[PDB]
């Protein structure tokens, strides 16, 4: 034969082929050699995740193309999201290598799962088919089940894995039932930009079976994004999983699911916009209302960050709701880019605090300013950026998200977003209020015996690449959007 | 390329009754062993349905893979449970099951009010050009091989990566 | 090499035709076709023949040769996803009976095949003898298959 | 013919599987009901490929991939079940409500 | 006939050939096979035993009919015992004391 | 048709044990007794009812077998289409076989396949 048609198409997924090669090389070296070294695992994970971006940036100017016979679409929209996934993995590897090593467990398996979830998240970003919109998030969800229970000994992690596996088998089967309904009442078409035509060809675009597919797809996607009553999987899993994996599932899962939701609600479901618009409006209003209200009654930091994430996802949903006309998708990014730094910094501070301290309760965060002023300053900056406080990234991100909402006439959505943002100050201020307690009687012995130690550690560099971003991107919110309105 | 009409419809009804019995056995048995054995009946009936439609390869794949899955399921249910417990025998009824029975009945009614209202034969006569097979590909398994090898390349390697990582995670998690 | 590939003659006096296929090949049941033979190892390399009822007395009653050959290739002999082209069209005549033999390539996005198809009309039947080989191995076997397509004969039943 | 009845059965299976997913007091049984739901989806896919896709067989290929995913889930758990039973010596999932 | 079947033989010749095959398979060969199993039962080597068992395996559908209508019970030592109540003429010409495998030949069976 | 014989053969093959059970029921006598119905335990009176509860490390090959069954199922359509296509499917399935080999090596080295 020629092996050429696939060879020229195989260069289009070369950034993912780099991840696959790094995965295989890491696995082969782990199997071949008995001894284990932290620096080599660090090097291979980093050089796998900094060569994919090197190849992806070299592929930015290239023409958009649909390769592997209607299976992989490369254009401007998915490239940004793939870069976001790679950035999340790159800033989560230092979060993971220290944490899993301090738990005395095998780390090559953890890096393998993270790299596979990144590989399955990059494929979900451009997945121009219905089979690969199922297989790729099953390359992510299965690894997420393998993660978050990698602890394997804590009684919390087993229950978290049970809940995650059962609820994500409940979803991603409703999603595929919707895929089957959409594929049946279309004429046997599965490519994304070929089933609206197939629907007209069979004249079933107003069939009652199309509403079932839309509802099932929206439910199966809103499970992964976790807005609205599809949110219950989030806090328990966020409360009973190791911190690096939950940070990864906080930033990497929302990016891939946002990309899939944007490419599944606009390309194959534009004829029925008046239905999924209402579904997303309900899904967002309920998300902000019931993610900002419950977060103010939280005694655990990871669970509070879970309710925080299910609150901030509703702000991003407005970008899908307004549509591509009044910016819209250009406001999904330039806020998800913000959200990544916000959450990864506020999780890196939690990682360091828990490792040096050994706790997760919020009440043990008292008096951290006296012990480690740098960590308290960084965590406070991350939390204030999370609350949309003025000189930090969240404020400009939220006003960008609300400008397009007001421009599209969605006064109710913007009003609910602003009211929930007001509610979203009491938390992200409660933690700081604890952090600035000089009362020695209210200071828990968890932070009384706290050693900062005269070494830098990797997470400090990883969140110094972040805290300086959530504050100094506030002038650079003109460079980012001109890369995000350029896509269409 | 089908069975005689009345035979086909009778087989549909009979296999549907067997499938209903197997599923009800799955969702009404306390013992995971008994419900697994009912699941096996469901698997066999579904493979026979695949043979009925046109799927002579998908039926064999279903039989092989899902028979391995149920054998593993029975082994791990024997290994991870209490005594043999033939006395358990149709676990008791609570209010929490009664409300979900109503919810699932409503969901099934919503699905069947769409299935019974859509003319599925009308769609078939509109997709005429999708049913003109290539005359050289006599073997249906040959067509499925060609369209698995060429049309779906990216999922074909993605599933390999998924299987490898699933094997590694299953070994790492379940080890003592 | 010795004498070329030896061929075996298949004669159906009940259906009133006769053609000639390589002796290495084996008989097999093509779906709904009257007769068929195929290579024992290679795929898409086979001869087949099925006939349809008709009221015409000769192929010349089908209209102009090139136009009806093109409409048969596009509409009947090819699936909608297969791109077709015809590379050679010939007419032969023996015993007052005419046979139209044309070579065409069907290039699906998955695979490519090449065929020699001989049409004839006699005994109230329309015969569509077809010789098929994969495109990758077409150039080697084309002559070795053309002898098949030039061997098609229809007589009185 | 009455081929649409197959669709009905698939829907029934889905609902039954959904029911068995909720009232499950044994996580092995919950995994089995997950297999039931995926089997109903596969029945829909296969009968739709029979209906509309006699040439491309996209529904059959999707059914094969769904079977692969279901087997991958059936390999990941009960390994998760193995970890849970090694740590807690109990399987009943409704009894574990520590994270709440 | 129908399209798909070609050059089928006449039914009378097929019936005659199948009848002669059944005649050779069901009532001719099973008697010879069971006699070749009864005689030369102790004269077998490995090859002869293998071929005997192969022929029995092939022709067993024809042997299952003849077996109920055959007995292979061993005969009395003297070839004069017409009846179980018959007495030998002289009880010395019989051969008593047949040996077995460690110290016997094929003549002692 | 090539598959109605399959259905008839399946029906006959399912009917045969039913015929055997019916013939045994109408031919064999029943003489049940409380000693006869007791579970056989080599003469001695059985203790608690059966049940063994194997170790996990013994039965960890089954999780490998689940994945390997899927891999060998996926390898069949490629082999069916190996001749119609060319070296493209060879390169395609080479990665599949290599991943299978790597997974087998991992199971071998990690002690999953040890008893
Ligand atoms: C208070 C902070 C902002 C101060 C006022 C901003 C104006 C600064 C100079 C004027 C101007 O046009 O700058 C224009 C700057 C330059 O920022 C960007 O630079 C790019 C260069 O590759 C291109 O010129 C873009 O168009 C431009 O927007 O716009 C800003 O975003 C100002 C802040 C720059 C980042 C500082 C950290
Ligand atoms: C590199 C990856 C593996 C190799 C991919 C394909 C092998 C390259 C040669 C293909 C040519 C071929 O068909 O194989 C030849 C035999 O070559 C080999 O066997 C060489 C490969 C050795 C080992 C590779 C297999 C194991 C890996 C037979 O010669 P030919 O003249 O019949 O073919 C010529 C023409 O290109 C046909 O398309
Ligand atoms: C944003 C970037 C995030 C990734 C890098 C975080 C900082 C890592 C760092 O500072 O280096 C560490 C990692 O350094 C290494 O050993 C690995 C080499 C550097 C890896 C990180 C950078 C890689 C990327 C560099 C550029 C690309 C190079 C490849 C392509 C040309 C230091 O490790 P150590 O020697 O202190 O570790 C001791 C160990 O924990 C004891 O058990
Ligand atoms: C193209 C192939 C590139 C392979 C690069 C691997 C490399 O640089 O060699 C490593 C591996 O070299 C070795 O010493 C191992 C022998 C080779 C293993 C690779 C074989 C499979 C390659 C595919 C380096 O070892 P290390 O000092 O970082 O420690 C790793 C060790 O295995 C575990 O601690
Ligand atoms: C943490 C990120 C902060 C934001 C960084 C902003 C950077 C400043 C603003 C840059 C605007 C100019 C870029 C606009 C698109 C350029 C497209 C292009 O041609 O890119 C080339 C250069 O590639 C890049 O550098 C693209 C990267 C920038 C765009 C994506 C940034 C990250 C996503 C932000 C979110 C292609 O690479 P090549 O080597 O094939 O091309 C050779 C030559 O340069 C042009 O022919
Ligand atoms: C003018 C507005 C200044 C206050 C808002 C602000 O920029 O954020 C913080 C101000 O940030 C700083 O403290 C300055 C250092 C980081 C720089 C952040 C931006 C400073 C203002 C930029 C221009 C506006 C406020 O919190 P804090 O960090 O002071 O909290 C107490 C801290 O833990 C004590 O260590
Ligand atoms: C082939 C299929 C054969 C038909 C199976 C169903 C038979 C008719 C329904 C009877 C119910 C039944 O068989 O239930 C048993 C469980 O059923 C099974 O497990 C059989 C189905 C497995 C089929 C495997 C196919 C692969 C035991 O439960 P019970 O309540 O009837 O028991 C009463 C008492 O304890 C005496 O046993």
mmCIF file of C-alpha atoms in Angstrom, chain A residues 1 3 6 27 31 34 109, chain F residues 85-88 102 106 109:
data_model
loop_
_atom_site.group_PDB
_atom_site.id
_atom_site.type_symbol
_atom_site.label_atom_id
_atom_site.label_comp_id
_atom_site.label_asym_id
_atom_site.label_seq_id
_atom_site.Cartn_x
_atom_site.Cartn_y
_atom_site.Cartn_z
ATOM 1 C CA UNK A 1 0.000 0.000 0.000
ATOM 2 C CA UNK A 3 0.948 4.215 4.478
ATOM 3 C CA UNK A 6 -2.377 8.178 7.227
ATOM 4 C CA UNK A 27 6.160 2.840 30.881
ATOM 5 C CA UNK A 31 9.115 -1.872 33.497
ATOM 6 C CA UNK A 34 13.997 -1.868 39.071
ATOM 7 C CA UNK A 109 1.403 5.108 37.329
ATOM 8 C CA UNK F 85 -5.769 -2.909 1.973
ATOM 9 C CA UNK F 86 -1.987 -2.963 2.170
ATOM 10 C CA UNK F 87 0.819 -1.999 4.547
ATOM 11 C CA UNK F 88 -1.369 0.748 6.040
ATOM 12 C CA UNK F 102 3.729 -3.955 26.643
ATOM 13 C CA UNK F 106 3.722 -4.944 32.716
ATOM 14 C CA UNK F 109 6.825 -7.685 35.889
#
